[PDB]
Assembly symmetry: D3
């Protein structure tokens, strides 16, 4: 479509992957309201498409996303913030049932990092950097920069990053558990698309059920989480993809999932 801040395209073999590239080189992919609206529109379009099984979110080679547009929230008041719910538009990735992979290249600072943390899988470039510089501007991370970061990298490093604003390299993020894989800067997006293809090659319903079961780990106790996992495992037996996969395992061949 006519997107002036993002570029949404169907990549990957058989056009099974959705790539949304934030295109704002003049502001280091600053997450303005219009950019967030365009991103939500692209996510809705890719989610309602039966061919796209996975989505890949990426930015530029120099900066993935520098965070919220400080120029816009400069004159905002407490009353305005509480009335308009400024950052409610940002929590749309959390509702996307299809897996989303974040290809983080370059600066992932503040909201950007938070954005990367809202995705399911994060692939970081060799020169990628993660930071929470909100404290340097008299603000705190307000879109998941303390909850998800603390749960992922622990209390110590999360506190350090949030109170000092120091940056961590892709290697530190991978060692702490924030990112799962490190890839070259030039092949990051390609490996992300390959992973998205590997994901989409499976049944979409089972993929969404597994995503929900994994997300439940941060919302429920271990016992209730295990019970919900058991209920979802029981429910998977009602789909035809489970039977097809089990028959393709018993009988030596490949499975053909119909997404039902």
């Amino acid at each position: 479509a006519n997107f002036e801040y993002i570029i949404a395209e169907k990549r990957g073999k058989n056009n099974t992957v959705g790539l949304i590239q934030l295109n704002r080189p003049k502001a280091l992919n600053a997450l303005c309201d219009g950019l967030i609206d365009e991103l939500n529109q692209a996510l809705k379009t890719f989610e309602e498409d039966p061919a796209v099984g996975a989505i890949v979110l990426t930015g530029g080679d120099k900066a993935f996303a520098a965070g919220a547009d400080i120029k816009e929230m400069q004159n905002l008041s407490f009353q305005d913030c509480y009335s308009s719910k400024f950052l409610k538009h940002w929590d749309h990735l959390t509702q996307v049932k299809k897996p989303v992979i974040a290809a983080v290249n370059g600066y992932a600072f503040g909201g950007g990092c938070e954005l990367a943390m809202m995705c399911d899988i994060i692939y970081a470039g060799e020169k990628a950097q993660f930071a929470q510089p909100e404290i340097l501007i008299g603000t705190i991370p307000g879109a998941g920069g303390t909850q998800r970061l603390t749960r992922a990298v622990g209390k110590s490093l999360a506190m350090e990053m949030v109170l000092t604003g120091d940056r961590i390299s892709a290697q530190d993020a991978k060692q702490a558990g924030l990112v799962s894989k490190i890839c070259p800067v030039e092949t990051l997006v390609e490996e992300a698309i390959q992973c998205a293809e590997k994901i989409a090659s499976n049944s979409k319903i089972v993929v969404a059920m597994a995503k929900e079961s994994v997300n439940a780990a941060f919302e429920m106790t271990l016992t209730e989480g295990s019970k919900l996992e058991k209920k979802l495992f029981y429910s998977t037996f009602a789909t035809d993809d489970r039977k097809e996969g089990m028959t393709a395992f018993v009988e030596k061949r490949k499975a053909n999932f119909k997404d039902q």
Copy 2:
């Protein structure tokens, strides 16, 4: 013992360790109903012996446990799953009050990894591999594969493993936090038995209290968890082992615990 799927024996000097080795090289230690029943029987036999203080669960050098038997759950309906409470036996391992050490060698896929994750300590071989290939057969984990895994390796790697089924290495499992030690393939079981001995040489009641206090970290908030830990610490003063150990420390001697 007339066991056809497992081998249970007392090991370690003074016979204080219990070793249960899964013996089914023809199915890569597929966790069938009979195998799980034999495992539960061996656990209950070692959990009631006043000599065994710790248990060590291991498999073959080629595969620790391939998971549930697909050939058994192939022709299984949702009604059957719900009525029979399928996979209930698998949770019995979590009821064992004595520490259980998982010596994972080779393949630990699906229900196997969960099994290793249901133990307190996991020792992995240099060539050991963990994975959650449920998605490849049209199903999802159902015994804590998405709950315990996510709480140890983070959201990114857990999501990746659950949605793609890719295998992780022992070094990756240790760096993420799934396993604690990487032992040679030829000495894994020996070091696991030595750790079980070291654990069993302490007060059994205090060991169980510590295990419960550690497990409570995944079921309660930090404040209530710390309060329960403090209550257990107060309760430990009712046992004679605490006074014995403290008097041995103050007198610079060895403590002879009586398990009471």
Copy 3:
């Protein structure tokens, strides 16, 4: 003031860091009642100082803190423990609103480790060692040794340490996520003071808000934690430091915060 077990002073340029050094070489900084009382007094003094923005807690070069005074709890009964509410003085550190950095050198065993775990950021020396030897004396941790450690280094390593009492090196602590950075034994305290300076250079109210937001990650679910974080982010707009920092960023100048 006149302290027998600790030394409290103001370090860092402009006298902005509060350094509390435990001084008890003959007992390896054993956390006795008097030592804890003096530590609480120093923490209260530094928290009520408008010039101190961060506190640095450290011990000796040989041992940071060996744990509670076993000599004092040897003849303690269950009734005495529950009537006196033992160890509650230790939780005062968790009530400090200002950030506290733990510079751990040498032995950090038992309560000492818990002490470091009660702080926000932990800096460990190259030769620092962490352990939980409570099980070796017939007791268990009672000040978060099984709750924070489990959440930090995972279930496997936490269980191993708690049930065996073995020690982990500073490198293992960093790889597991218990500590954030490793510094030479000669510059540990200096680097900790330098980090505390950077921390205190920001708005104190915003720093406290960020600390509360990060701490909320261990007391609430992801949804409620994120909602509380959003509410605190909205509230930050009521302070003048937020507007000052945002204007300095827009104007490309240094922000002169005033703690309001």
Copy 4:
């Protein structure tokens, strides 16, 4: 608007209340997809008007709402429900910032009860009846009929109603804590509108803050709930309505709130 399933109009003096009356006497106000869409549209319209401070949801004198249209979900399959998320649109009531009062007359069965339970205040007629007859049609509540009802009336009565579908009278609903006030059939709507006026006469920002604080009681522990309540109380001081009301009370005069 040209709504065909509901009637939305401004009521109360100064047009401060919004009234949405479900109009479908041929199906006992069955909650069909079109009716839910019209209800959500009316809510969004009333939630964006700076004059409407409260909303009153009501139905007919014979039946408030008979629940979802069974004739529409008759042929729905498990995959269809999982993919389309049949009962997702119903949750919009939970996202309304302004308070909503439910005027229940006659039958409030199944969804109609859940809908009433999704509102903040419930006023029932002298002859109103509540029930959960899902069990009688081979299904269970799916919009909170087992969570809110159990928290409101308790485990015993909730279990009874859910497993038998027996109807409870407005008197038994007030005695159990589900209904707050019982009114005559011919005066229920007027008293509900008077209560909505009393609510809207206050500062809308503080009203929404108090609504959120009350809702937080069912989402977090008592300690974190009280901490969030204290944080919201601190934040209320940033508004002008707080100081205005406090000065009007200290001066013994009327307060003129301006919603800021």
Copy 5:
């Protein structure tokens, strides 16, 4: 049967109700280990029986249950309690998938109340009395007396009953939320059996699903509870009883559930 402490019978038309009556009038139905074992055996028998859809638990006309056997627990010690895990067998009632109705006649003190609180529905007689006199004998409840009671009657009444040991009448329990119906002493068991028949008349799988969804209210937050309820509602469509009932209603006829 060969039982000596209880009487287990199949009552109700078509023998669809399971009646377990405590038959130890010489000790006011003291809950001894043998009585609990017989109760668990009868519960397992009635659960494995496909004809039984609901269970009714009752005692004598003078006393339902006086609680645990004070004579058996007199010489117990802390070490014995911790090693044998006293009162664990009592939790079997919480694992019964089929609904259980408690017909409380006469005294229900201590455990007898907790047992009654472990069931899904509680029918109390006009002369029934509930109390927690454990405090009068130097111990606190240990089978949910402080957890389930507080969640039903409120903090004030629960605290009063637990600390003073005072008794509450059946009317007080009905007005608080502990019991759902009050019946004459002569027809209590008959009305309980009628309710059990009405419950069993529905599909057993959906009844168990609804019971689980209701129990979920006391284990997770409102959001996760509603999500689990919605997932169970989706899963109910995989059964044939849902479609059967919906078609029977659409065709204006009675539904014939086959429990599948």
Copy 6:
């Protein structure tokens, strides 16, 4: 001592009850800083006294407590409220380990009600009235007025009370679950003192353990709550009062508890 705003005395036979009466009829017992400080001092004095087993908090015949002093918080700003941690002195009442009974007479509005809600048992007079008028001044409760009230009287009535500032009589408060007993205005304090005596006539350690178990119901899940209750029940066996009471019961005699 010389208290200018309260009167603390030892009432009840054997001087086993601690009565604290708020004496400020000119401001309807408005809770100010000095009044709260004196209340905390009296509470600490009565808690440290080995003879007082229970405390009774009461006010005047016309008003129990009209809430916080609006005259002081009038000119308070957000920064002041946040830096000073306003109203934390009110939480000390929740830290009292001994039971506290609230005798409410006349007006119990806002903070006062919260104060009554902070106690364990609430005895209300025939003319007592409870309300949350914080909405009528432009603020919200800040001492648990929305959490405890919502957990006690339900959402439907708590929302109304918080958004309208309406007064509920002692009868409604008792029917909803906020108060446990209604007594004449002239005999309220006497019955409260009698209940305090009945409570103090038991083992103080067991009473404190029971209070802790009951309070745990609002901080943990049902399963973890039951496990903590079981742990406390096991710990009670370490005290001598348990054995004494059990022997007195088995021997049909009066128990002589030694508070140990």
